Amino acid sequence: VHEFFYSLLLFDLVYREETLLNVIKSVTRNGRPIILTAALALILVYLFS
Amino acid sequence: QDKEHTCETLLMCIVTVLSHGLRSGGGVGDVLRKPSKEEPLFAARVIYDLLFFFMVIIIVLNLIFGVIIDTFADLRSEKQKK
Amino acid sequence: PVPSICEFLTKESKLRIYYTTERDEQGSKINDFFLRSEDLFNEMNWQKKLRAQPVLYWCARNMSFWSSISFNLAVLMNLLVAFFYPFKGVRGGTLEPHWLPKPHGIRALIASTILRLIFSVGLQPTLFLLGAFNVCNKIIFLMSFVGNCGTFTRGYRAMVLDVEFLYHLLYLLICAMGLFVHEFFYSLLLFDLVYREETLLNVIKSVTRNGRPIILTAALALILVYLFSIVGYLFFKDDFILEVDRLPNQDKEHTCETLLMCIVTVLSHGLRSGGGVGDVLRKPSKEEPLFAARVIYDLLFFFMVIIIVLNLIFGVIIDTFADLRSEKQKKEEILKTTCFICGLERDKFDNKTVTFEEHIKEEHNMWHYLCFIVLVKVKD
Ligand SMILES: [Ca+2]
Ligand SMILES: [Ca+2]
Ligand SMILES: [Ca+2]
Ligand SMILES: [Ca+2]
Ligand SMILES: [Zn+2]
């Protein structure tokens, strides 16, 4: 189809690498705290607007 | 280059604040027009800018980053123990 | 034999008593556990009394339903206010078409009815109807809450003293004013998300647990900017030229004429700018007699304030947010691997006769101790 589809193949680096998976698990392990904090930021900017 | 009004609708006003004030490093007071010291609402503008900066930029984003740091230390602690 | 009244505990109260009991400076949970015995007895009495009312019991048996309905309706009306305000002017759609789980189907049907109502009758009537329904659901929830808690038998001093009841009354008042005064009052209802959510409360406690360090650091930053503004007023009076624009009934303007305005300029522009105060002051030439003074002033402001004080506030926040995790881990680990009553450790039961698991549910079960206390209290 298009040569640009080879860009998605870089995501295999996370699968192949063990340390990068841990660095990602840093943000995905407590992702609910982060989602809730983002919602709180949305509430604050809504009030300020 | 011509200026344009953006807070005519509440949705556009929210979009302006959330897309410019949040991304700017100095808060929302940098995208709004800067007032003179003779305005009746100069103090109100100063207080609004400072409150936005302190509550959002200083606190909430740093709080997200602190969450990330604490999790990234919790993983190391449990891995060391295991 | 366990008393007959002991069967009137909800699981929620049991979990709360198991989790929220604190060790004393002795290292024992016995005193705090005993201090809640009379409260547990009184609420068992109220639970037994609630049997005779078949409708109040049904209403008080559905906290989750009323709370979830109220929260969902609040967020729905808040998005509807945000996206379509002001409601002056309606644009129709009508394109070439248009536009197993039971709870998902119910939510989808409710959303379909809501969208048909908003596209059929209008915006303001829909908002009014939604606000009225929210007020009705809130009063139902309030009746359910007061029925389940049952503290109204203690007199109106109990209503005044507690805070959850007061919080719900302010919630209801805000809903009523949003229905009657202005639609913008529904924005305050988003603060119930912090109340409903457990993790967000901990993330807030990160900053509120040592808030005095942060207040003191902010005061120190104010002192530093005050000193820097004094120095600037003394030596760099004519460099405080800022850009302004006058609205009709871009020209520069002097701002450090008064010490108050000079402080305001420094504190509102230098502190917010990422490069210090040297970016809002007029930039000098290399032939000026005070070029080195300006460079030193800019660098000192940057290094002392931007690099140090703000990062120090953030470090305070990080350290508190790690302290909470440390103490929670310690408390939960003590909870898991130690008998509630005698306080013995798990390793004492490694291979002797009976294991720890049956020890903490047959011979030192705390619920049996509570039953014995109730029996002694109720038996003649
Ligand atoms: Ca920007
Ligand atoms: Ca950040
Ligand atoms: Ca600025
Ligand atoms: Ca910072
Ligand atoms: Zn025992």
Curated annotation (Swiss-Prot), chain B:
<comment type="subunit">
    <text>Homotetramer. Homodimer. Interacts with ERP44 in a pH-, redox state- and calcium-dependent manner which results in the inhibition the calcium channel activity. The strength of this interaction inversely correlates with calcium concentration. Part of cGMP kinase signaling complex at least composed of ACTA2/alpha-actin, CNN1/calponin H1, PLN/phospholamban, PRKG1 and ITPR1. Interacts with IRAG1. Interacts with CABP1 (via N-terminus). Interacts with TESPA1.</text>
</comment>
<protein>
    <recommendedName>
        <fullName>Inositol 1,4,5-trisphosphate-gated calcium channel ITPR1</fullName>
    </recommendedName>
</protein>
<feature type="transmembrane region" description="Helical">
    <location>
        <begin position="49"/>
        <end position="69"/>
    </location>
</feature>
<feature type="disulfide bond">
    <location>
        <begin position="7"/>
        <end position="13"/>
    </location>
</feature>
<comment type="function">
    <text>Inositol 1,4,5-trisphosphate-gated calcium channel that, upon inositol 1,4,5-trisphosphate binding, mediates calcium release from the endoplasmic reticulum (ER). Undergoes conformational changes upon ligand binding, suggesting structural flexibility that allows the channel to switch from a closed state, capable of interacting with its ligands such as 1,4,5-trisphosphate and calcium, to an open state, capable of transferring calcium ions across the ER membrane. Cytoplasmic calcium released from the ER triggers apoptosis by the activation of CAMK2 complex.</text>
</comment>
<comment type="similarity">
    <text>Belongs to the InsP3 receptor family.</text>
</comment>
